[PDB]
Curated annotation (Swiss-Prot):
The modification Phosphoserine is found at residue 30. Together with MRPL18, acts as a mitochondrial import factor for the cytosolic 5S rRNA. Only the nascent unfolded cytoplasmic form is able to bind to the 5S rRNA. Formation of iron-sulfur complexes and cyanide detoxification. Binds molecular oxygen and sulfur. Substrate binds at residues 179, 242. It comes from Bos taurus (Bovine). Pfam families: Rhodanese. This is Thiosulfate sulfurtransferase. The lineage of its organism: Eukaryota, Metazoa, Chordata, Craniata, Vertebrata.
Length: 286
């Protein structure tokens, strides 16, 4: 699931990107910090297309960045020249090294595509290492992509609610500790309290990355799940604010050998608007 900058740079130089290897910039940033779409248009790895999280989602949903239908995903990805036989590599240019890129890797897999990788180090290290960048448009041939929802890799509201009595799945929240505890507010929202679903364990997503922006080694990732007593041989759902940093637990677990962490896509935003208040706690008392 991880490709290095070195590997990607050699493939770009040898002219290997095209129908068998597609590269995606999956960047997105909060209102008022960076503009992802504009930054893409100006500098990208040669041959890379932009994957727009704002477009490829269920736009009619009241909740944040929910999965599109199979058809909606299929059409979008087909127009970027990705077929079922394509190896897809996704990166984003966040300062941490990786923020939205694990969400897109999971998106391809929850729609049945297994050949997808995240650029280890992100665009931040592509740039740091001086690898080539262009402003010229990537214009790929359309392809046909067949999506099949892979229901094992997704959890819905109802399934997470039933789990509160049955405890059949470990639930791990990837949000920063203060937000999980309820001591820090939820960003980019008005009236949403912070806090966590009763029974979830917290594993802040940023701790899987080194200060340089790279993924920690499998050895270290294993040691991280063991210290929080998250058993990787048992069912495990990852949740966060809107289903995005949760995918970093799926990715980390995938590198330790567990390929089936499911993501609660509605996450805290859906949960707070739909669940009985007794199902979650906050140190801000509510």
């Amino acid at each position: 699931a991880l490709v290095s900058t070195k590997w990607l740079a050699e493939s770009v130089r040898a002219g290997k990107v095209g129908p068998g290897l597609r590269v995606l910039d999956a960047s997105w940033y909060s209102p008022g910090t960076r503009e992802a779409r504009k930054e893409y248009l100006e500098r990208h790895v040669p041959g890379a297309s932009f994957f727009d999280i704002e477009e490829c989602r269920d736009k009619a949903s009241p909740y944040e960045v929910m999965l599109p239908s199979e058809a909606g995903f299929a059409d979008y990805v087909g127009s970027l020249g990705i077929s079922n036989d394509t190896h897809v590599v996704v990166y984003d240019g966040d300062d941490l090294g990786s923020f939205y890129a694990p969400r897109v890797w999971w998106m391809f897999r929850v729609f049945g595509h297994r050949t997808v990788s995240v650029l280890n180090g992100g665009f931040r290290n592509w740039l740091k290492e001086g690898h080539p960048v262009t402003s010229e448009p990537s214009r790929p041939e359309p392809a046909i992509f067949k999506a099949t929802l892979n229901r094992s890799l997704l959890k819905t509201y109802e399934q997470v609610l039933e789990n509160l009595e049955s405890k059949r799945f470990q639930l791990v929240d990837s949000r920063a500790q203060g937000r999980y505890l309820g001591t820090q507010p939820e960003p980019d929202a008005v009236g949403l309290d912070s806090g966590h679903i009763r029974g979830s364990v917290n594993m802040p997503f940023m701790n899987f990355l080194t200060e340089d922006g790279f993924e920690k080694s499998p050895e270290e990732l294993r040691a991280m799940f063991e210290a929080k007593k998250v058993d990787l041989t048992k069912p495990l759902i990852a949740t966060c604010r809107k289903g995005v940093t949760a995918c970093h637990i799926a990715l980390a677990a995938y590198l330790c050998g567990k390929p089936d962490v499911a993501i609660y896509d509605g996450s805290w935003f859906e949960w707070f608007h739909r669940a009985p208040p007794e199902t979650w706690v906050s140190q801000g008392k509510g």
